[PDB]
Amino acid sequence: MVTIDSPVAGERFEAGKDINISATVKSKTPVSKVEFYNGDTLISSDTTAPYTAKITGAAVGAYNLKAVAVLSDGRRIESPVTPVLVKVIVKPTVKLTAPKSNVVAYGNEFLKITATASDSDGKISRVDFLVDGEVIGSDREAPYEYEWKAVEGNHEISVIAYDDDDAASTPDSVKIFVKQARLEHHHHHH
Ligand SMILES: [Ca+2]
Ligand SMILES: [Ca+2]
Ligand SMILES: [Ca+2]
Ligand SMILES: [Ca+2]
Ligand SMILES: [Cl-]
């Protein structure tokens, strides 16, 4: 059989970048060459393992990639189509809605982090929640929320959204201070 190893079906690329194509051949007969196609159009052919091709500066649109091994006895075997997409990529945006920088929090108490996320061209796949740069949880469904067991001291809470192209937003962050659990005092309210 002949397999296209990369890219994988359904992969999305950015307009103007390159698509590099790799094929593996399994056959009892030695391979003369592997031809690489986009639809019916020959990209290029490769007489040597590893079998590679490259579409340089790919324009937007669908690419229907196939590899064909030409074997030493004249036979041809072919991969299935690997269909990929080249598009304009537009990163999502994220906004941290809680906590605020002046949050009153204590060590060991759970503190709810919340965010909104938007993608202008596509959709949000998930929001990741981070504390001092470390992912503590993800939420795949709006509303975006995570309950963090608070850790005493100064911490930076951030969120990063990921879209359906796996493009990440820039992070949105807040700096907070978490008090020692022993310093929780009465505070009047109504
Ligand atoms: Ca080669
Ligand atoms: Ca997007
Ligand atoms: Ca949720
Ligand atoms: Ca903000
Ligand atoms: Cl503490």
Domain ranges in the chain are 1-89, 90-190
> 93 near 169, Cβ under 8 Å?
yes
Alpha carbon distances (Å) from 167 to 12, 63, 102, 160: 10, 20, 31, 10
**Is 121 known to sit in a ligand binding site?**
yes
- CA of residue 55 to ligand 3 center, whole Å: 40
Tell me which amino acid residue 114 is. Answer: T
Adjacent-strand bridge partners of 117? 94
Superfamily (CATH H level) for 1-89: Immunoglobulins (2.60.40.10)
Is 90-190 the same fold as 1-89?
A: yes
Residues 33, 159: Cα–Cα separation, whole Å:
48
User: Would the annotation count 78 as a binding residue?
Assistant: no
> In whole angstroms, what is the distance from residue 182 CA to residue 99 CA?
21
Experimental technique behind these coordinates: X-ray
For residues 36 and 105, give the distance between their C-alpha atoms in angstroms, rounded to a whole number.
60
Surrounding ion ligand 2 within 5 Å at CB are 90, 119, 121-122, 163
CA distance 27 to 90: 42
Ligand 3: distance of its center to the CA of 127 in Å? 9
Q: How far is the CA of 115 from the centre of ligand 3 (A)?
A: 10
Burial (Cβ within 10 Å: 0-12, 13-18, ≥19) of residue 83: middle
| The total number of residues written for the chain in this structure | 190
Distance from the alpha carbon of residue 182 to the mean position of ligand 5, in angstroms: 7
139 is in an annotated binding site: yes
Taking every pair of Cα atoms in the chain, the longest distance, rounded to a whole number of angstroms, is 89
CB 167 within 8 A of CB 130: no
- Give the CATH class of 90-190: mainly beta
Q: What string of DSSP letters covers 57-92?
A: SPPSEEEEEEEEEEETTS-EEEPPPEEEEEE-----
Spatial distance between the Cα atoms of 190 and 117, rounded to a whole number of angstroms: 33
Resolution in units of Å = 1.7
Q: DSSP character for 10?
A: T
Q: Which residues of 130-165 are buried (b: 16+ CB within 10 A; e: fewer)?
A: bbeeeeeeebeeeebbbebebebeebebbbbbbbeb
